[PDB]
Design a binder for this molecule. Structure first.
Ligand SMILES: [Ca+2]
Lengths: 75, 145
């Protein structure tokens, strides 16, 4: 039973990094489709300087890469 | 495989970070741009983000490393496997499904919790059918374009 109770606790140690990976992946995915960017402000902002949204995407990729590593470090 | 124009788009984004124009992105330049947008990363978070793409070891990001990161995004083999492995941690059935209620519960209570509107946009992006289960396998194929 103790062999059945300590593999839960280590499996619980992956729950948070697994959630962080899913959240960082979705937030990266939503950068190109979310209603948050479907406003007249973001369309004009994306027209006069498309570098702003690309920078925001570059940051989210960097955060997805960190989250993927921390999740793999719990294997 | 990248057009010369979308390389110039990534160059424009790189130049936004590279304020001094020395061809590298330091933690100083990465964090300054992030905090101009309202984000507040710690110094350690800036080092972890840079070290994920720093293939040289000097602690900076050059343009070729920036190009590969922006081109790959999540479309790599390792990302699809790991995101799939993350979804399986919350799938005690092992059949490749997770209920919409449990997924909503995990996203809004673990790690960097999603807002109510964020998780609502995620659940709408994944078609539920029948009892309320969402094939998270189809979900990771969608996120990884
Ligand atoms: Ca620089």
């Amino acid at each position: 039973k103790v062999q059945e109770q300590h593999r839960q606790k280590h499996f619980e140690k992956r729950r948070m990094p697994a959630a962080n990976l899913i959240q960082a992946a979705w937030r990266l995915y939503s950068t190109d489709m979310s209603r948050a960017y479907l406003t007249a402000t973001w369309y004009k902002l994306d027209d006069i300087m498309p570098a702003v949204k690309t920078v925001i995407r570059s940051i989210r990729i960097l955060k997805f890469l960190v989250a993927k590593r921390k999740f793999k470090e719990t294997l | 495989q990248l057009t010369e124009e979308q390389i110039a788009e990534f160059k424009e984004a790189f130049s936004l970070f590279d304020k001094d124009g020395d061809g590298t992105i330091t933690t100083k330049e990465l964090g300054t741009v992030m905090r101009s947008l309202g984000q507040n990363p710690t110094e350690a978070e800036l080092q972890d983000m840079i070290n994920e793409v720093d293939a040289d070891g000097n602690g900076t990001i050059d343009f070729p490393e920036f190009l590969t990161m922006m081109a790959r995004k999540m479309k790599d083999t390792d990302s699809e496997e790991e995101i799939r492995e993350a979804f399986r941690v919350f799938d005690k059935d092992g059949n490749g499904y997770i209920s919409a209620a449990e997924l909503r519960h995990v996203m809004t209570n673990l790690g960097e919790k999603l807002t109510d509107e964020e998780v609502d946009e995620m659940i709408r992006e994944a078609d539920i059918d029948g009892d309320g289960q969402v094939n998270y396998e189809e979900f990771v194929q969608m996120m990884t374009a």
